[PDB]
């Protein structure tokens, strides 16, 4: 999962997991 | 890979409300960035906003927002940024960048220029 | 308002030269994640910007390794190994950690 809510961008794909 | 193909060059008067129109190719427009950047002769590059048709979801530059609405054609996968009510300040290149895989924008668009009597 | 600036404003350079455009900040542009998430884009007269550098030192594919960036803090360097005639245009230096995100003063490089 992610640790917050919104969009999923490529730039924040590094806080997957 | 990435196209982004822009309009060409318009020549208006103000008090007009003018929908620039920025074309995605080869990409579907919702996995990614729309960002304007406003570029006059007298400024360097000037992020206006940024759009994600995929929720129409907006972030402003305060100091330009509300001259400039930004809005999508979702499906055709055109994106628009609607200058309204001008000022001299309209009169500028307006680039059109496309995030990037990674983590800021690959490729920029082609220019679409509004010239403002 | 992270105000980022470059010197000098025009680079005159000989054909495989070493080209060295120093940018300055005027606040930190460290992402909260941990990273620092500086670009820089060349457009060329008549063309829009593109991307060649990313994340300060990582190049974009397709792009010549003769391009990479350097710095840290506010205090950044573009580092061209072997500028050519096909190398020439204006740089700018866009930080994409602070909203409303900025550019860079802009660097014209010259043969």
């Known amino acids: 999962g992610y640790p917050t809510f919104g969009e999923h961008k490529q730039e924040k794909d590094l806080e997957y997991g | 890979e990435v196209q982004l193909q822009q309009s060409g060059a318009e020549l208006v008067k103000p008090g007009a409300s003018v929908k620039l129109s920025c074309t995605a190719s080869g990409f579907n427009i919702k996995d990614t960035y729309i960002h304007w950047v406003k570029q006059r002769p007298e400024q360097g590059l000037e992020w206006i906003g940024k759009?994600?048709?995929?929720?129409?979801?907006?972030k402003y530059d305060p100091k330009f927002q509300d001259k400039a609405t930004i809005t999508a054609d979702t499906s055709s996968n055109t994106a628009y940024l609607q200058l309204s009510s001008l000022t001299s300040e309209d009169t500028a290149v307006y680039y059109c960048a496309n995030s990037n895989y990674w983590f800021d924008f690959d490729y920029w668009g082609q220019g679409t220029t509004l010239t403002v009597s | 308002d992270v105000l980022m600036t470059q010197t000098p404003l025009s680079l005159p350079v000989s054909l495989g030269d070493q080209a060295s455009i120093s940018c300055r900040s005027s606040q930190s542009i460290v992402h909260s994640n941990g990273n620092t998430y500086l670009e820089w884009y060349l457009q060329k007269p008549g063309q829009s910007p593109k991307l060649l550098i990313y994340?300060?030192?990582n190049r974009f594919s397709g792009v010549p390794d003769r391009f990479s960036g350097s710095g840290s803090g506010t205090d950044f360097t573009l580092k061209i190994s072997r500028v050519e005639a096909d190398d020439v245009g204006v740089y700018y230096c866009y930080q994409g950690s602070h909203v409303p995100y900025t550019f860079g003063g802009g660097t014209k490089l010259e043969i």
């Open positions: 759009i994600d048709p995929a929720n129409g979801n907006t």
């Open positions: 994340k300060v030192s």
